[PDB]
């Protein structure tokens, strides 16, 4: 296809620089946008450098562009968490009016933990407490969570959230069946100093 | 500014589709796009004023329409499942450096429409442990057996709309991941403070607003109708 992008997903801790890849084929494109989009929302455009220029610098964010190779780069300076969304290479013969788009990255940031505690508690249903849920959490972003090894058990990816009244942030994982919490997410790594009540 | 409508849809094979897009910025380009996975936007139509359009990079399945300088029509008169995905409309002015998106149009073409189903909601009380462990409450929501994915989760607390201390999936998972007749499930979580759920006069409710079938379409199934409509759970303070 016309205009290509790497990696297909690139996560990055906060503080650290971002490196998004493009190139394209087409050498009359005059113009080369970068759209940014965030989940549930349209794409807008970020930042944008024209054929004549080699750089183009933003505030944290800067284009690099190479003619020469056909290569275009975005620099993203101490990647923040709402920086966490889907990046969009594009490019245009008509100054920046009719885009042919690449795949696109997706970027994530993930959180520092201050005080990182691990556990996984159970959790009733408020209506029947024959159902209930198994929550991991208070976990560092360094973990994956895999999914499941089977069917009829399942996994939710990781979500962090932030409690705003304080100050505090919390790395979250869901699992449910219908079995043991004890058992629930052995497919993943655990700290050894998990909590299990 | 760029409305679509509707931003939801789901219809059957065969069946007319339109999306409509109406722009107040005064631009004389507009264009429709759709979005895929490992195929990031790609050109539908577009239109360089009224009374105009042009074939874009896949116009194969769609017609267009621009009757005004702020209307913008993507139609589809023979819908087919390959055509389901998320339409973007934008508005550009001569040579503009930008083009003014939309927020989109999630479009399912079912074919059967007997596999349209609404959520079951369910909340999860915080857990002993971690109420006296950490100090802290997860309310944990769970909206399972749906389909399409077409939905909105939030949490209200004393019947007001809370953001912080909250966190959704990216993106609901498939029950059964063989089928991709599947239907869906979500999760959520909710965190406060082990006094504030120590509060029996605090409630809480998990809501999702599930996007279904209009009314005026017809149903010849036993079941309820899966419309679009609020499916909620509650949980009060102990």
């Known amino acids: 296809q016309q205009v290509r992008q790497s990696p297909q997903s690139l996560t990055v801790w906060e503080g650290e620089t971002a490196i998004l890849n493009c190139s394209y084929e087409?050498?009359?494109?005059?113009?080369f946008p970068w759209y940014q989009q965030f989940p549930g929302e349209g794409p807008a455009l970020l930042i944008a450098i024209r054929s004549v220029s080699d750089k183009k610098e933003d505030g944290r964010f800067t284009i690099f562009f190479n003619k020469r190779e056909k290569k275009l780069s975005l620099h993203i300076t101490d990647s923040q968490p709402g920086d966490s969304a889907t990046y969009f290479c594009?490019?245009?013969?008509?100054?920046?009016?009719?885009?042919?788009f690449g795949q696109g990255t997706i970027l994530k940031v993930y959180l520092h933990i201050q005080n990182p505690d691990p556990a996984v508690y159970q959790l009733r249903d408020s209506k029947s407490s024959d159902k209930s849920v198994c929550l991991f959490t208070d976990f560092d972003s360094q973990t994956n969570v895999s999914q499941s090894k089977d069917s009829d058990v399942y996994i939710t990816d990781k979500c962090v959230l932030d409690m705003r009244s304080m100050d505090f942030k919390s790395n979250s994982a869901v699992a449910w069946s219908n079995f043991a919490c004890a058992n629930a997410f052995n497919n993943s790594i655990i700290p050894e100093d998990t909590f299990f009540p | 500014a760029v409305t679509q409508s509707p931003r939801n849809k789901v219809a059957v094979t065969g069946g007319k589709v339109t999306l409509s897009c109406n722009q107040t910025n005064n631009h004389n380009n507009m264009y429709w796009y759709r979005q895929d996975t490992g195929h990031g936007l790609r050109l539908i139509h577009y239109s360089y004023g009224a009374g105009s359009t042009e074939k874009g990079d896949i116009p194969d399945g769609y017609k267009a329409s621009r009757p005004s300088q702020e209307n913008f029509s993507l139609i589809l008169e023979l819908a087919t499942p390959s055509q389901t995905s998320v339409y973007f409309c934008?508005?550009?002015?001569?040579?503009?450096?930008?083009?003014?998106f939309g927020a989109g149009t999630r479009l399912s073409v079912l074919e059967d429409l007997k596999n349209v189903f609404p959520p079951e909601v369910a909340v999860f009380e915080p857990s002993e442990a971690e109420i006296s462990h950490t100090q802290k409450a997860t309310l944990v929501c769970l909206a399972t057996g749906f389909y399409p994915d077409h939905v909105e989760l939030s949490w209200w607390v004393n019947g007001k709309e809370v953001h912080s201390g909250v966190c959704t999936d990216p993106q609901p998972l498939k029950e059964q991941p063989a089928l991709n007749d599947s239907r869906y499930a979500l999760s959520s979580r909710l965190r406060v403070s082990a006094t504030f759920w120590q509060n029996p006069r605090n409630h809480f409710r998990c809501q999702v607003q599930f996007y279904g079938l209009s009314e005026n379409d017809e149903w010849t199934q036993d079941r309820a109708k899966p419309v679009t409509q609020i499916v909620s759970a509650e949980a009060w303070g102990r």
């Open positions: 934008a508005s550009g002015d001569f040579w503009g450096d930008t083009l003014y």
């Open positions: 087409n050498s009359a494109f005059d113009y």
């Open positions: 594009a490019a245009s013969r008509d100054s920046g009016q009719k885009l042919v």
